[PDB]
Each structure stands twice: as C-alpha cells, then as structure tokens.
Motif scaffolding. Structure first.
Motif, PDB file in Angstrom:
ATOM      1  N   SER A   1       6.906   8.601  -1.174  1.00 30.36           N
ATOM      2  CA  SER A   1       6.136   7.552  -1.338  1.00 30.36           C
ATOM      3  C   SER A   1       7.060   6.500  -1.808  1.00 30.36           C
ATOM      4  O   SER A   1       6.465   5.232  -1.002  1.00 30.36           O
ATOM      5  CB  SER A   1       5.011   7.891  -2.600  1.00 30.36           C
ATOM      6  OG  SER A   1       4.365   8.889  -2.172  1.00 30.36           O
ATOM      7  N   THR A   2       8.107   6.417  -2.416  1.00 25.47           N
ATOM      8  CA  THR A   2       9.178   5.358  -2.838  1.00 25.47           C
ATOM      9  C   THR A   2       8.354   4.262  -3.774  1.00 25.47           C
ATOM     10  O   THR A   2       7.726   4.750  -4.650  1.00 25.47           O
ATOM     11  CB  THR A   2       9.698   4.905  -1.732  1.00 25.47           C
ATOM     12  OG1 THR A   2       8.641   4.024  -1.019  1.00 25.47           O
ATOM     13  CG2 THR A   2      10.251   5.992  -0.679  1.00 25.47           C
ATOM     14  N   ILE A   3       8.742   3.098  -3.671  1.00 27.19           N
ATOM     15  CA  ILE A   3       8.212   1.953  -4.214  1.00 27.19           C
ATOM     16  C   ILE A   3       7.624   0.695  -3.258  1.00 27.19           C
ATOM     17  O   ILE A   3       8.303   0.517  -2.230  1.00 27.19           O
ATOM     18  CB  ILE A   3       9.398   1.325  -5.176  1.00 27.19           C
ATOM     19  CG1 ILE A   3       9.451   2.335  -6.331  1.00 27.19           C
ATOM     20  CG2 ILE A   3       8.671   0.039  -5.797  1.00 27.19           C
ATOM     21  CD1 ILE A   3      10.806   3.122  -6.066  1.00 27.19           C
ATOM     22  N   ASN A   4       6.551   0.168  -3.262  1.00 28.84           N
ATOM     23  CA  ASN A   4       5.715  -0.601  -2.356  1.00 28.84           C
ATOM     24  C   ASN A   4       6.084  -2.075  -2.809  1.00 28.84           C
ATOM     25  O   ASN A   4       4.898  -2.509  -3.125  1.00 28.84           O
ATOM     26  CB  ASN A   4       4.348  -0.061  -1.780  1.00 28.84           C
ATOM     27  CG  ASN A   4       4.754   1.319  -1.507  1.00 28.84           C
ATOM     28  OD1 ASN A   4       4.084   2.078  -1.598  1.00 28.84           O
ATOM     29  ND2 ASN A   4       5.692   1.545  -0.538  1.00 28.84           N
ATOM     30  N   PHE A   5       6.922  -2.913  -2.580  1.00 24.80           N
ATOM     31  CA  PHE A   5       6.978  -4.355  -2.797  1.00 24.80           C
ATOM     32  C   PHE A   5       6.450  -4.875  -1.421  1.00 24.80           C
ATOM     33  O   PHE A   5       7.665  -5.560  -0.875  1.00 24.80           O
ATOM     34  CB  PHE A   5       8.528  -4.897  -3.331  1.00 24.80           C
ATOM     35  CG  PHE A   5       8.495  -6.234  -3.742  1.00 24.80           C
ATOM     36  CD1 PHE A   5       8.072  -6.677  -4.752  1.00 24.80           C
ATOM     37  CD2 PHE A   5       8.901  -7.029  -2.607  1.00 24.80           C
ATOM     38  CE1 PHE A   5       8.021  -8.160  -4.984  1.00 24.80           C
ATOM     39  CE2 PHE A   5       9.006  -8.535  -3.091  1.00 24.80           C
ATOM     40  CZ  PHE A   5       8.616  -8.828  -4.162  1.00 24.80           C
TER      41      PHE A   5
ATOM     42  N   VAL B   1       1.392  -4.187 -11.016  1.00 25.60           N
ATOM     43  CA  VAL B   1       2.332  -3.182 -10.499  1.00 25.60           C
ATOM     44  C   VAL B   1       1.405  -2.070  -9.637  1.00 25.60           C
ATOM     45  O   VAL B   1       1.772  -1.742  -8.673  1.00 25.60           O
ATOM     46  CB  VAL B   1       3.047  -2.554 -11.860  1.00 25.60           C
ATOM     47  CG1 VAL B   1       3.535  -1.345 -11.341  1.00 25.60           C
ATOM     48  CG2 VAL B   1       4.389  -3.449 -11.918  1.00 25.60           C
TER      49      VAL B   1
ATOM     50  N   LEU C   1       0.770  -3.142  -6.135  1.00 26.99           N
ATOM     51  CA  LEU C   1       1.672  -3.130  -5.174  1.00 26.99           C
ATOM     52  C   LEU C   1       1.852  -1.350  -4.924  1.00 26.99           C
ATOM     53  O   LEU C   1       2.229  -1.160  -3.526  1.00 26.99           O
ATOM     54  CB  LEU C   1       3.033  -3.368  -5.834  1.00 26.99           C
ATOM     55  CG  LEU C   1       3.174  -4.871  -6.040  1.00 26.99           C
ATOM     56  CD1 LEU C   1       4.516  -5.085  -6.818  1.00 26.99           C
ATOM     57  CD2 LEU C   1       3.149  -5.675  -4.863  1.00 26.99           C
ATOM     58  N   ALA C   2       1.633  -0.654  -5.991  1.00 28.32           N
ATOM     59  CA  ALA C   2       1.673   0.947  -5.585  1.00 28.32           C
ATOM     60  C   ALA C   2       0.862   1.376  -4.263  1.00 28.32           C
ATOM     61  O   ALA C   2       1.163   1.964  -3.535  1.00 28.32           O
ATOM     62  CB  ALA C   2       1.340   1.825  -6.673  1.00 28.32           C
TER      63      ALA C   2
HETATM   64  C1  LIG Z   1       9.579  -4.323  -8.190  1.00 29.20           C
HETATM   65  C2  LIG Z   1       8.823  -3.337  -8.744  1.00 29.20           C
HETATM   66  C3  LIG Z   1       7.557  -2.814  -7.720  1.00 29.20           C
HETATM   67  C4  LIG Z   1       6.525  -1.570  -8.423  1.00 29.20           C
HETATM   68  C5  LIG Z   1       5.510  -1.251  -7.096  1.00 29.20           C
HETATM   69  C6  LIG Z   1       4.730   0.216  -7.739  1.00 29.20           C
HETATM   70  C7  LIG Z   1       5.617   1.601  -7.506  1.00 29.20           C
HETATM   71  C8  LIG Z   1       4.822   2.422  -8.151  1.00 29.20           C
HETATM   72  C9  LIG Z   1       5.417   3.839  -8.119  1.00 29.20           C
HETATM   73  C10 LIG Z   1       4.543   4.965  -7.377  1.00 29.20           C
HETATM   74  C11 LIG Z   1       4.961   4.707  -5.982  1.00 29.20           C
HETATM   75  C12 LIG Z   1       3.665   4.148  -5.275  1.00 29.20           C
HETATM   76  C13 LIG Z   1       2.645   5.198  -4.719  1.00 29.20           C
HETATM   77  C14 LIG Z   1       2.046   6.432  -5.702  1.00 29.20           C
HETATM   78  O1  LIG Z   1       1.206   5.827  -6.467  1.00 29.20           O
HETATM   79  O2  LIG Z   1       2.569   7.413  -5.505  1.00 29.20           O
END
Ligand SMILES: CCCCCCCCCCCCCC(=O)O
Ligand SMILES: CCCCCCCCCCCCCCCCCC(=O)O
Lengths: 55, 293, 48, 96, 250, 250, 250
Positions: A9-13, B3, B6-7
């Motif tokens: 999934s990683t991080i989604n900026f 936050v 963005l997820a």
């Molecule tokens: C620069 C910080 C950006 C943070 C973005 C959100 C990241 C959340 C962590 C989990 C990854 C997204 C998908 C999920 O919820 O499994």
C-alpha cells in the motif's frame, strides 16, 4: 486494493492542489459511477426478466 | 485528520458484476429469452437464465471505462506555424482556439453532445530540424473581443490583463490549467440552429451550426525579437481535458471529416463494416473436425 | 443462424422477410488499456 | 443494443446491410447467416456502439448479447436455431 | 404487473390519443419534463406558462410509406413554431423551454410487413454531402430547407449515415422505439428539455430532431392497400415562454 | 394460476428452447427424472454423471410433413447413441440410465390445418407384417433398420396399428400430446427412466419409442408454403453411465 | 512413522497400480490437484466434471531401454488427447484443466544396473538444433512431430541439454524422481494444474512435459534378459472441461 499487482500500500502523498484556484487540481478520478438504466431501460412500465414483455 | 485523507487517495478497484450458479428450468410461463426490442429498451436477459452458469466471483476492474479516464489524455488540437522567413516574415501568428481540427481528439469529444471540463494546454515548440535553441517565445491567450496583435511589436503584447506565457524553445514544454470558459452551462459540439435571427437565404449557409458559446478566443504566439529571425517555429498545442462531465451520448462518427466546424461527408459513403464475400462467410480456419458427425 | 423448421406463410403474404440483429454487452462486461482507434483517418498531422 | 451489420456483403448497400434476409426454403437445414462475435474484428460488430468502444481499448471481457427482432408479417411463423460455437472449431457446415 | 400493456391512452390538454398496439412508452433519459427550477433559471422576467392552450397533441404531418421510401425527419420546436397558440407564444417570446410527447402512428394489416425506427436525436446537425469531384462543392452547407423543414418534414437522402455522417446502426443510443407492423403500430417518446441553456429561442435553435427511418422495407402481396400512412403527433409539455416582444416568424 | 401459459422457455445445459405456443408440458406418470437411488442401485461401480456435457437439447432430425405422410418414429436412446458427448459416454460404458425432455417443433400459418399425435411408447417392439399368402413370410421379423432407425428415424408403414398390432386410437394411454396447427406448434414430454432394471445398455436396449403420427392430414390452399417441417429435439436428463471399457458402436 | 514405506498402492477410478519398490510419491510444489475455485474461475459456462470416467490410470506407452538409449519425452495432456473418455471430453470442449498422477514402471533383476531420471517440466518448449554450417538451418523450428509426440512419445536427440538448451544437471529443479534399479522400480509424480490461465485448450497447449532420461546407462552381464521395458501410466485428477462444441482432433 490498488492496481499495484502485488501485496503493498506504501504512503500516498498525491492529489495535492498547490494553487488558490481549485480548477488547477489533478483529474478528479476518485469516484466511479455506473447507472446504465437511463439508456438501457428508459420505458415507463418496468419489465421483469421472466415475464413476456407485451401482453 | 488530513493524513487519513492522503491514505485513501490511490484509485480503488471497483470489480465487474459476478455470475451466480444456475441450473435447468423446465417450466412454462417464465421466458427470460423473449424480449421486445420495439419497446426501445435493451434486453434485460442475464447469462444465468439462458444457459447453466457456474458461480464466478469476477475480480476484473471497471475503473478505466470512465469519462474521466477516457478523456484525461493530452491529444494534438492545433499546430501553429510562427512563420518568420521567405514571403512570411511576420514572426507572429494568431491561431483560433478550436479542438475540432484533428480527427483523433474530435471523434472522442463528439461521443458527447454537451461537455463541461477544465483543460490543461501544453505547448511543444521546436524548429524545422526538430532543434530547440535558446529562442524566447510569447504565448498570449486573447479572450473573445480582446484586441488581436497586428505586428511582431504591437502594443497588444504588453499583456496588462491578457494571460501570456514566456518560455524558451530550450525549456520543457509550457503547461497551464484553463477553466470551463463558456457563457452556457456546458460546451456543445453539435448546435442545431443559427447564432443570429434572420431568414438564412444565402447561397452558402456558413452560419448554420456555429454557436459562439464554444468559440473561446485565440492564442497569439510570437518570437520576442526586433526583426526577422529567418526561422519558422512549429507549436504543437496539446489539450488534456479534466474534471469532465458529459451528457447525451451520440454515435461515433463513421464517415471521414472534410471541414473543421461542420459535419459534412463525401457523397462516397464508406460502409461502417468492412464487407466480405457472402453473409455465410467467416474468416476463421479453426481445427480439423474429429467426425466429418 | 439455421432454420429449425421452415419460414411458413399463408397465401397472399410475403414469403421473404428480414431479421434485425442488435449487439450489446452484458453487466459483467469490462474493458482495459485505453488506446487510439483504427476506425478514423485524416491524411496527415496537418489537416482539418 | 445497436444494429449489427450482418449483411456486410460486396453487393448490399445502405440500410440493406442491416437486414438478414429470410424466406420459405425448399430444403431444410440451410444456413441463413453467420458472423464472428469478437467486437474488435473488422465485420458486423463495427456498426455497434460496443464494437466502436472496444476499438478504443486493448482487452475486453464478459458476456456479449445479440437480440434478433423478426420483421415478417403477423401471419408468418417459423423457428430458428441460433448457435454460438466456442473458439476451437470452424463455422459449422451442418445444423447437427 | 412486470409487463407493458398493449392498450394505452395518452390525454394532454383537450386532445386524447388512444392506441391498442402500444409497445410501452419511452421516457428519454428516465427524466420527466418539468418547469425550470429557480436554481437553474438565469432570466429574471416572470415566465408565462399557457398550460392546456400550448400543452396538447398537435397532428402535423402525414407521410405515405413506400417500398423505396428512405425516411423523414422534423426539428422540434421548428415543426410546431407556426401552428396553434404554441406557435404564437413561440413567435411573441424570445426565450423558450418545453419537453414533448412524440407519437408516430403507422397501422397496416397482419399481411403487410416492415420496421420503422423512430428516434429523437438531440442537436441533430444536418450535414451536406459534397460530391467527390470538387473538395468544396456548393452543397457543403445544407440550405435552410434541410436544416429547418418545418411542418412538412424533409426526406433523408442518405439515411444510412442519418444525413450527419454518424451510423444509423448506432442511432439506437438516442431515445428510440421501433414500429414493427408485426407487433405494434405506434411509437411514443416522452422527452424532457435537453439543452446546455435553461431557455433558448424556439425560432433560432432546434433542441431535437424527430427521425422516422424504414430499416426493414414495407412489403405486401398484390391485393393489399398500397397507401400506408405514417403520422407525427407532438404534444409540448411544461411549456414556458419569456421575454415578450413583437411577434417574429423565423 | 389454474391455466397453462401459452409462452414457455426450456433451458437444459448450454441449450434453450423458446416456444410461444406451448400447450403445457407432459411429465410422464407424474414423476420427474432422477439419479438412481442407493436402494435401487445394484451395480457397485461408481457411476459417472457428466451433467451439462450430456444433459442438453440435441436437435437431431427434421422431417417434411406432406398430405399423405403416414408418420415417423425414433428409439431412445438409440436416436442419440452416436451424437455428442452423450454418444461417446454411451459407447464407452455398459450400463446406462436417464430420463429425457422431448420437444417436437412444427409451425404452420393460421391458414394450414392438421393434427400430429406425438406419443412416447415405452418398450416400442416394432412388429413385421407378414403377407396373407405365406404364413411365415421372410418379413415376419423386422430387420435392424426398422428396430433401430437411429438419428434419421423410420416412416410408419401401418400407423393405424402403430406397426405393433395395437390400435393407434388407444395409444393415448401412453404419455402423449397433440400438435393442432390451430392451437399450438410444439409438444414437450418429460419422461423419467422407465425400465425393470435400474441401468441398461444404451446400445442393445431402447427404453422408449418417440412416435409422431399425423391423425388429421395436413391441408392448405394453393399459395401457402408447401414445405412444413417437423423437428425432434431431445435433452437427456440425470444421465448416469457406468462400467467403463473400450468404446463399442452398436 | 518418519520413513516412506517401500510397498504402496495407488487407486484412482476403476484402476489400481500396486508397487512393492515405491521410493515415496512426489507431490509437485507441495500442492494437491483441485477443481478451479470460484475466485480464479473466469469462464461463466458450468464446467463438466466426468470424475471416474476421465480420472483413472491410463497405460499409454511402453519403451525398450537399451545401453545407448538417450531418453524419451511426452507432453500432457497431448499424450492422452486421443485415448479414452478423457480424449473425447478434450476434443468436444474448448477449455481444459486437471492435475495428473505420473507413474513410470521399470523393473530389472538385482543383477542389472542403471538410473533413469523421470522429471515433469512445466512448459517444456522443445528447441530445434541448427547445424553450425548455416545460421538459419531449416531445423531451427521443431516440426509438429517433436512438439506434440502424442501417445508414442519422442526420443531425445540431445538429452544433455534436454532438447531445450537448458542443462539436464539442473533439471532436478523441476519435480523429479529417480529409478535406481538398485533401490526402486517406479517413480510417481502427482502434479497439480500449473498454468497462468485457469483453463486452457487441451489440444493447442501442453501444460507439462514428461521426460524419462537414462543418466547411468543400463548395463548387465551376458545371460540376463536384454529386453527391459519402461512403461508410462498417467491418471488425470480433478479434470474439468468447459465450452462444449463440435469434436475437434488437434
Ligand atoms: C507525508 C505523510 C503522508 C501520509 C499519508 C498517509 C499514509 C497512511 C499509512 C497507510 C498507507 C495508506 C493505505 C492504508 O490505509 O493501508
Ligand atoms: C497562453 C495559453 C493559455 C491557454 C488558454 C486556453 C483557452 C482554451 C479555451 C477552452 C478550450 C475548450 C473549448 C473549445 C471549443 C472549440 C470547438 C469549436 O467550436 O470548434
């Protein structure tokens, strides 16, 4: 549940607008809608699948 | 907070409709196969009622057949030639902004009657030898009724209010976001009428089909110079529609287009389907039949 | 399309008719990988 | 549902290309018409909205749907076997 | 019920259309015609709603269907822009909006055969076919007669491309209905006001094209009645006119 | 409801039969076809059930009905013993059992007339008529062609005695249905497995005879289509094969 | 137990293979053959599962092992695509899927010696060796006989490169088993359905290659039986056919 074709999934900026005008934003493609009936079944009397349509 | 926002931004997979397991139906009264095309409705019959199906939990994604995805792809909408050599030493060109110039984009957009979108415009500019020297160029958007420049150095290039873009050919292509600019609530590729009152009794009915709700001004492009550079510049304009809503789907054009702003076709009617020898002829060899039953 | 039985008409009725085939897709229909179409052609990159 | 151009033959022209002709037969089990059911292929599917949208994409999946509307007189009766052959085989030479 | 009844009665204003072979009624885009809401309304003039006076079935054109007939089309509201109180309201006012109830009546005996596709094409821009010989033939722009046929309607020259360079096969995308002389004898299309603008000039702009095209040609045996008419009857619905001035005809 | 609907759809396997003039469906002896129960089963080999592969509508024979046509009969499973996966399963295995769904399709215009009795006769022992002249005429025992016609079926020589010395009038005792061109155009007989043994050889023994006999002859006026076909379509149901070995054809 | 028993009995359908020198059974990739799950299934046609009819041991090919024999290979399901009910189901249907139970039987006396590597190679693309002389020798593409040997199998020309340009030494990466005439006399490889697609055409595509290669050559003293056969016996498992049509042979 992405198009990554593997576990991860990683991080989604992403999808960030850097301008005061909202029409400067990236393509709005978060939402998908599929309502076909307005074109495929526009008749007043809804016809059931089983029943012979004209009687 | 923002936050969590963005997820959940990665495009999620919407799956296609699943099939349910079905068995034989030997009864009178229930006739899924029989339809009535005359009513104007498409057949409501499912695979499960016509044949014995197994359970399939379909995981194929449908997210890409969207009007967003279909149209959110930059396509060539104009080629402006800034002539500054030979007979044409103007060193500036004013190009009427229209997207109906090139087949590939025109034909896609004409799937809809009405469309409301923001667009992103990219200017890929270069010379005749595909070279990009350090040559400064001014792209000025001239809205309808803004004065159009009549010379390389005219007062119209001061741009107190007209939006302009200075870039060198040397730099990566200029890009800008443009809003939904139209007096009407949506754009309209087909306008069945005349923009003016009158009786329209001209040997050449040019005015028919031309709604100015679509005409969105000109782009004036010059080489910021004092004199003839002796070099022609090609400006390929690329439009990527976005934030797209579309209404009233239409048939995809079959006939080749002839002019820009008028649906008109050659009297030679090219058939929609490529013809074959006879109505019982298919081009498929298949395999060697086991019992020739 | 085969004739399961024959096309039978009474006297004073046309003995030749037409069938109109209408093609579509079902609810499980899906597409993938947007590409440019083959179906339309202008002469070159510089045309109307 | 949009019309298939099944009568896409050398001779047939205009709206005639959208009609599968049928008639009283002297001989049983003759082939009335035949078409392949891959929307991409140059052929009867080109005339359908589905066939034209498919050519904007590389890959397709799911069930297709052919509706056949007969337009003889009320007094005309008949039965038609509309068979679909999966990919292995050639166009069936007999109804059996 | 789960089935459309064969027999149907359509009563608007002081006119009633009864049909015993209705193959259901098409409601275009699954939306009913309605008066412009306050939110969509741009123009501040109070809009006149003549109701029954303008909202009623008008039987405008009857056409003789032949074995080689290629089809006919009309432009709404152009077809009605000079007939009845509607015509007068449309000439006297600038802005215009209404949906309509189309009803194409074509009966024949159980010993005739043929199929008419009746289709409402929004923004039906009539094209002009240019002869291959000259690139800019004078017939590159269709004359006023072809774009605005009025009450009498216009014969298709190339119904295969719907005189617009778009395949007739794919015309079924628009709100359509068939008249199979086998099954039915009428086609009803209720159409709401479809336009980018909330109100438009009835005279200058045609919201919809009404096209009746014989797909399967009319055939019959010697002895049957050769004259088989096709009649167009149109009822404007939720008509609203605004911007009153001197009556202008086209 | 309390009435049989005219319009009916029969879907078995990857085949569907639609009929708009079904005069109801006969379920022979008011029993549905089912797999052999454990209690009735004598043979210890696990029986293969190919399901959709074998259980589907097969359109085997079409016959031209004439004014003097005397009738046709088929023997099940002999008719299908060489057609499709069923045929192969029937040749490869010793023991066999299934019921079937018969469907005889015969349409004609509202200006033709005639009646076909369609009757399923269990253990239809074809007789041979011996000429009065000699007591033991060579045609005292019917040759293999008459007992096992296969896919093409066999023409009755004496349909009055159903080629078995039993009156056709009393044939209505067996599961039967009429095709009156006045009322209907199809006859459907669902038949369960009827035999003294739970499983039998498909090749050696024929459980049922399928007889279509024109009682009222086909008559029509000059101008109507003379060619009126009668088509037999059979769908095995709950097929079960056992005792696998080398494929044997008859 | 913690040890594999020497003596073993393999019973599928109406066939049983008994062996008293089984060196254990290989289950390829530690996965059992199973029917396609709903989630992996793409094709909506109900798939026929003939069970015992198709799922049983077929003894197809026996080969004579000699001191200079170089090896043999077969392609599954190509080897069985024309034998028994499996063959018929495979010809009559488009889509195909099954795992299999390989069993190579090779006995010799305690006074013979030799080792056969028996290995199942998924997607065994047979190569063609081109003579050094010409860069594009006609034998750059192997003819149909080499790619699809059928029941009789094909002799390796270069078993060192497994006729595919990959070293035989590293062939032990694939599911394999040895027949050391010292220890054992049979090799059993249960293999699940391995393919990128859930169902494939039995005729066009070969999921696995069955290769028996003599690594240590067969040697024996004068007086022993020279004829030492190697027999291939294959049992399809969890066979599932779909897309029924006209029987096609290759
Ligand atoms: C620069 C910080 C950006 C943070 C973005 C959100 C990241 C959340 C962590 C989990 C990854 C997204 C998908 C999920 O919820 O499994
Ligand atoms: C300096 C460059 C800035 C970019 C400004 C771009 C302005 C474009 C206007 C919006 C484009 C869409 C409308 C196109 C309609 C024309 C079609 C036609 O009627 O032929």
């Amino acid at each position: 549940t992405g198009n990554i074709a593997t576990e991860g999934s990683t991080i989604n900026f992403t999808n960030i607008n850097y301008y005061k005008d909202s029409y400067a934003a990236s393509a709005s493609r978060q939402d998908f809608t599929q309502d076909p009936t307005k074109f495929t079944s526009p008749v007043l009397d809804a016809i059931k699948e089983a029943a012979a349509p004209l009687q | 907070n923002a936050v969590s926002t963005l997820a959940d931004t990665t495009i999620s997979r919407v799956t296609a409709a699943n099939t349910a397991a079905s068995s034989h139906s030997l009864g009178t009264g229930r006739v899924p196969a029989l339809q009535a095309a005359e009513t104007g409705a498409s057949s409501n019959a499912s695979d499960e009622n016509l044949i014995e199906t197994r359970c399939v939990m379909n995981r194929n994604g449908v997210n890409e057949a969207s009007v967003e995805h279909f149209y959110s792809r930059a396509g060539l909408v104009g080629v402006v030639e800034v002539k500054d050599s030979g007979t044409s030493q103007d060193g500036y060109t004013v190009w009427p902004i229209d997207v109906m110039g090139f087949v590939q984009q025109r034909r896609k957009l004409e799937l809809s009657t009405y469309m409301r979108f923001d667009a992103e415009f990219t200017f890929v500019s270069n010379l005749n030898d595909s070279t990009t020297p350090g040559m400064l160029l001014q792209y000025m958007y001239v809205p309808p009724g803004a004065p159009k420049p009549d010379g390389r150095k005219s007062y119209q290039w001061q741009t107190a209010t007209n939006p302009s873009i200075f870039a060198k050919l040397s730099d990566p292509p200029p890009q800008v976001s443009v809003p939904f600019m139209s007096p009407a609530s949506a754009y309209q590729w087909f306008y069945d009428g005349y923009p003016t009152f009158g009786e329209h009794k001209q040997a050449t009915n040019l005015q028919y089909g031309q709604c100015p709700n679509n005409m969105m001004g000109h782009f004036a492009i010059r080489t910021v110079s004092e004199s003839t550079t002796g070099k022609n510049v090609h400006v390929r304009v690329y439009m990527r529609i976005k934030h797209v809503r579309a209404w009233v789907p239409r048939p995809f054009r079959s006939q080749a287009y002839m002019v820009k702003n008028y649906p008109t076709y050659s009297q030679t009617i090219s058939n929609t389907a490529a013809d074959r020898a006879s109505i019982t002829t298919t081009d498929y060899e298949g395999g060697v039949p086991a019992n020739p039953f | 399309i085969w004739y399961q039985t024959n096309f039978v008409v009474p006297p004073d009725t046309p003995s030749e008719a037409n069938i109109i085939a209408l093609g579509a897709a079902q609810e499980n229909f899906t597409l993938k990988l947007c590409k440019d179409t083959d179906e339309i052609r202008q002469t070159a990159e510089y045309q109307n | 549902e949009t019309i298939l151009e099944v009568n896409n033959t050398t001779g047939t022209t205009g709206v005639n290309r959208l009609l599968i002709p049928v008639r009283a037969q002297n001989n049983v089990d003759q082939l009335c018409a035949s078409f392949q059911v891959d929307p991409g292929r140059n052929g009867p599917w080109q005339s359908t909205m589905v066939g034209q949208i498919c050519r904007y994409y590389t890959q397709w999946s799911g069930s297709l749907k052919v509706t056949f509307m007969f337009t003889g007189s009320f007094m005309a009766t008949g039965k038609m076997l509309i068979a679909y052959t999966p990919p292995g085989s050639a166009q069936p030479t007999t109804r059996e | 019920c789960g089935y459309s009844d064969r027999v149907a009665q359509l009563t608007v204003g002081n006119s009633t259309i009864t049909t015993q072979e209705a193959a259901n009624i098409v409601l275009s885009y699954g939306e009913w015609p309605g008066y412009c809401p306050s939110t969509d309304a741009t123009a501040v003039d109070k809009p006149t709603r003549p109701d029954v006076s303008v909202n009623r079935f008008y039987t405008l054109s009857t056409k003789s269907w032949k074995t080689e007939s290629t089809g006919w089309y009309w432009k709404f509201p152009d077809v009605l822009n000079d007939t009845g109180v509607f015509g007068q309201n449309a000439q006297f006012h600038y802005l215009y909006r209404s949906g309509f109830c189309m009803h194409v009546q074509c009966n024949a005996s159980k010993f005739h055969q043929g199929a008419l596709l009746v289709v409402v094409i929004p923004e039906f821009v009539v094209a002009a076919s240019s002869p291959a010989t000259k690139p800019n033939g004078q017939g590159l722009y269709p004359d006023f007669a072809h774009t605005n046929p009025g009450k009498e309607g216009q014969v298709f020259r190339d119904p295969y491309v719907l005189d617009a360079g778009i395949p007739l096969s794919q015309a079924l995308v628009f709100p359509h209905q068939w008249i199979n002389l086998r099954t039915n004898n009428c086609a009803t299309i209720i159409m709401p006001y479809v336009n980018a603008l909330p109100f438009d000039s009835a005279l200058n702009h045609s919201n919809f094209g009404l096209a009746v095209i014989p797909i399967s040609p009319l055939k019959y045996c010697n002895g049957a009645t050769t004259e088989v008419p096709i009649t167009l009857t149109i009822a404007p619905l939720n008509s609203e006119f605004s911007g009153l001035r001197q009556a202008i005809k086209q």
